[PDB]
């Protein structure tokens, strides 16, 4: 409350530590569904089913940009990739897989480098 604060978390490292962990997704072998925007002309459904879309390249861009005010709004984008990718995709298509495995490989890093 007014003059009274919990001790101050350094969170001087967490932009670099968020471009680190965006990097090892980037190249993930399973990233190619989530590496740029859907084509919203070329997929049927996708802009009136996925009322927020979010990508690899659109973080990158926000994270470079001063766009993410911390590191939670940072984590609440990547999720939103891996949530929109449930709502569009089957579990058992190579593209379903592909997001329960990349939200599992972001989970860990994630816990490790933060918690």
């Given at each position: 409350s007014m003059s009274v604060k919990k001790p101050k978390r350094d969170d001087s490292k967490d932009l670099a530590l968020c471009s680190m962990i965006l990097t090892e997704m980037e190249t993930h072998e399973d990233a190619w569904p989530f590496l740029l925007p859907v084509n919203l002309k070329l997929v049927p459904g996708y802009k009136k089913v996925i009322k927020k879309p979010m990508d690899f390249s659109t973080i990158r861009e926000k994270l470079s940009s001063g766009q993410y005010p911390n590191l939670e709004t940072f984590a609440l984008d990547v999720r939103l990739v891996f949530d929109n990718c449930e709502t569009f995709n089957?579990?058992?298509?190579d593209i379903g897989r592909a997001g329960h495995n990349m939200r599992k490989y972001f989970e860990k890093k994630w816990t490790d480098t933060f918690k």
């Open positions: 089957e579990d058992d298509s």
